[PDB]
């Protein structure tokens, strides 16, 4: 949940290392992608596409252990001055691609950092951002140039709640060293299906590791493989990944002059070659 | 007359008759410009590089902010730096293509072994330009790729650590490192590359271009 | 065509040709045909491209240095990709250093190896051209491998 | 960091140059000129 | 890598476009 980043990390979603703190709970890893134009003009609505790809027909494990679909969600960090374009400056063809997305600023006075999610994964494989470029003419804080854009996108449920406890989407280990005995389902009406794991022999050491429903069971009976055995397998099918790109807040006046200079160079190059052609005429008249 | 003035002193005609006495053979194609383009890229680096020495401040508490000042506030500053970056990458690329020609035209064989060797030295010097300037903005990207290469010559069993300590001016990477790196970038290497370019060019003018294929 | 045949009746030219020189005494005149008319074209062309590149794709200002924070995926410039690959792929730290220094020192020995042959055309010397093409391919391979993680850098994400 | 546009310009020119050099060698390999080899 | 291959093809291809353009200019004047 993108708003859980706000609850746990209020000032910024991005560590000095550029880790994008979403990974602190979403321990999985799947590819993410952000596609913006190479260069945009000042005060111009453009399209920022965020791709959060995965198998459209694949389900995960819910809190009840039930098989449910996946919801996507991402955090996009735009350069200073950039923000979601006003609703009246978005063309009809663009609004269609965007959808019912709820673009949410990370905190008060930070419209360049946006939160999105949870959104239906089967429908929002990619997310279209209606971004409005800033204007260095009306703002003396914004400059023309090349700036960086950061993205952190996620699929499926997380592994750790903000409280600190684990969930039913990762694996489970063992306490110490001992042999198991009873494996059944201690289910409740107000709760859900559990699984009891016993520990015995060695020296003393009688304990029980209760594991929630969801994960598989690749352990049959009577085992004692140290402490840290994955007796539950990994039910995680989601994934969090990152991507980075560069957009250039280009000034049209800088391009126009560049074209003019390039034209001067080409024209001057031509005059030199034509000049050599004139010299080649004279030299052929004095060879003999 | 003005020509006759200079002629009586230093014999100016002796120079003009040394340039108009040189011909370029038919086997010399377009790829024989790669050496000159590499030089052109450096001359661009020298101009733009000098220009940036008027605003850049080689201090850990000043370097980053100065680069921002050039990009944002200095008239055409964004262009001088952007040119200095592209012209840097182009110089290295043109140099590699220049090597491709020399080898695939056998221009390194007798009697031009020294021209090739001085070229290899020039190549090491040019790369040294890139590495040092890379860490001058003192950004996250520059600081860490200079913190990695600084420890590389610590593998040498005898003088290894001494070599490293000389490069970063201490046991770590700090102000001493940036100071030494700025010295290498704007003083040491410009003189070194000027010397070996001179040797490179003098040996070429003396022996001329290599034979045909 | 503006061409001057080599004067083979001049002993001083033949002596230079024997030592592999004197190839700047025949052909098109350097001045002013090339130096005055073609050279400014090349220079202006070189400058115009860099300028055009600098306007369309201007330099970027990264984030301030943090000695307590290591960047995720930090790479050197493109020409250091193959060396950087050798640096991290080789387990023995000293061996990687030697292999790195082998690149410039090896190139210095190149003329002292192909001095056996007088041929300059790559086709008349096929052994050298093969080793060159091999090394050129290996260099590019190491370079691309630098962009990939250490787990999948050698296989280049194929096998 | 990584510059995609730059990495493209490198490969494009490297292969063009290499190709062009062998083309230049082949042209003079088949047609030897005035006392040269 | 979208911007990469895009630039690789162009930088490689436009050389021949310029090469041929120069040869065509030679035939017009009569080389």
């Amino acid at each position: 949940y993108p708003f859980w980043a706000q609850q746990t990390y209020p000032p910024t979603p991005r560590e000095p290392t550029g880790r994008i703190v979403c990974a602190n709970c979403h321990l999985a890893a799947k590819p993410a992608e952000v596609e913006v134009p190479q260069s945009v003009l000042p005060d111009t609505v453009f399209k920022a596409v965020v791709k959060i790809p995965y198998d459209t027909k694949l389900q995960q494990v819910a809190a009840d252990g039930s098989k449910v679909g996946l919801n996507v969600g991402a955090v996009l960090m735009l350069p200073e001055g950039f923000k979601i374009a006003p609703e009246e400056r978005i063309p009809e063809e663009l609004k269609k691609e965007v959808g019912d997305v709820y673009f949410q600023p990370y905190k008060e006075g930070q419209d360049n950092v946006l939160l999105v999610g949870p959104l239906p994964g089967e429908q929002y494989q990619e997310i279209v951002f209606p971004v409005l470029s800033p204007n260095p003419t009306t703002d003396k804080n914004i400059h023309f140039g090349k700036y960086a854009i950061h993205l952190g996108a996620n699929r499926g449920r997380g592994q750790i709640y903000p409280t600190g406890e684990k969930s039913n989407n990762n694996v489970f280990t063992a306490s110490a060293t001992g042999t198991i005995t009873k494996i059944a389902k201690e289910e409740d009406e107000y709760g859900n299906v559990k699984y009891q794991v016993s520990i015995q022999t060695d020296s003393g050491k009688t304990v029980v590791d209760t594991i929630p429903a969801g994960p598989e069971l690749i352990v049959s009976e009577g085992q004692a493989v140290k402490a840290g055995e994955a007796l539950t397998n990994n039910p995680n099918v989601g994934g969090f990944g990152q991507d980075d790109t560069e957009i250039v807040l280009q000034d049209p006046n800088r391009v126009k002059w560049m074209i003019a200079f390039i034209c001067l160079v080409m024209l001057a190059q031509l005059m030199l070659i034509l000049k050599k052609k004139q010299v080649e005429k004279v030299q052929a008249a004095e060879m003999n | 007359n003005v020509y006759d003035w200079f002629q009586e002193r230093l014999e100016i005609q002796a120079l003009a008759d040394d340039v108009t006495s040189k011909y370029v053979p038919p086997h010399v194609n377009i790829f024989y410009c790669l050496g000159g383009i590499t030089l052109t890229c450096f001359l661009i680096q020298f101009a733009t590089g000098f220009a940036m020495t008027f605003y850049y401040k080689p201090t850990v508490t000043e370097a980053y902010a100065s680069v921002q000042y050039i990009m944002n506030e200095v008239s055409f500053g964004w262009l001088i730096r952007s040119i200095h970056r592209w012209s840097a990458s182009m110089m290295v690329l043109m140099m590699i293509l220049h090597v491709f020609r020399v080898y695939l035209t056998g221009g390194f064989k007798k009697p031009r072994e020294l021209t090739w060797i001085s070229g290899v030295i020039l190549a090491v010097i040019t790369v040294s330009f890139g590495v040092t300037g890379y860490s001058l903005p003192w950004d996250q990207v520059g600081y860490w790729a200079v913190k990695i290469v600084s420890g590389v010559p610590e593998a040498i069993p005898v003088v290894g650590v001494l070599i490293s300590d000389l490069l970063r001016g201490g046991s770590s990477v700090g102000q001493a490192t940036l100071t030494r790196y700025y010295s290498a970038h704007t003083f040491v290497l410009p003189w070194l590359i000027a010397v070996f370019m001179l040797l490179h060019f003098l040996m070429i003018r003396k022996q001329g271009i290599s034979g045909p294929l | 065509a503006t061409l001057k045949k080599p004067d083979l009746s001049d002993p001083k030219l033949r002596a230079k040709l024997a030592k592999g020189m004197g190839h700047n005494y025949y052909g098109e005149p350097a001045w002013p045909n090339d130096l005055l008319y073609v050279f400014p074209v090349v220079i202006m062309g070189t400058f115009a491209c860099i300028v055009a590149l600098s306007v369309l794709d201007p330099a970027m200002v990264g984030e301030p240095a943090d000695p307590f924070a290591t960047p995720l995926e930090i790479l050197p410039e493109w020409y250091l990709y193959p060396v950087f690959q050798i640096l991290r792929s080789v387990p023995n730290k000293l061996l990687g250093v030697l292999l790195m220094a082998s690149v410039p020192l090896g190139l210095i020995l190149v003329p002292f190896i192909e001095n056996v042959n007088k041929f300059q055309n790559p086709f008349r010397r096929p052994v050298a051209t093969t080793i060159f093409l091999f090394g050129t391919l290996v260099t590019i391979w190491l370079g691309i491998g630098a962009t990939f993680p250490l787990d999948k850098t050698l296989t280049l994400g194929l096998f | 960091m990584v510059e995609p546009l730059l990495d493209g310009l490198v490969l494009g020119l490297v292969f063009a140059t290499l190709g062009g050099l062998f083309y230049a060698a082949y042209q003079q390999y088949k047609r030897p000129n005035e006392l040269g080899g | 890598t979208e911007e990469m291959l895009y630039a690789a093809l162009l930088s490689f291809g436009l050389i021949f476009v310029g090469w041929g353009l120069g040869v065509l200019l030679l035939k017009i004047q009569g080389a």
Binding site: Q38, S39, V40, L41, Q250, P252, V255, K256, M258, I259, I262, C263, V265, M266, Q269, L270, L272, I273, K276 | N29, I30, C33 | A1, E28, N33, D34, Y37, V38, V41, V42, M44, G45, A48, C49, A52, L53, V55, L56 | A24, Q27 | L10, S11, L14, I15, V17, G18, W19, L21, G22, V23, L25, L26, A31
Partner: peptide, 28 residues
């Protein structure tokens, strides 16, 4: 779309420079 013509300008000046060299020195 002035951004498009900008990149075109780069592509053209790079192409035109090679053309002028090949034309100028009858190069290869």
């Amino acid at each position: 779309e002035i951004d498009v013509l900008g990149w075109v300008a780069l592509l053209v000046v790079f192409t035109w420079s090679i053309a002028m060299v090949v034309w100028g020195r009858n190069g290869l």
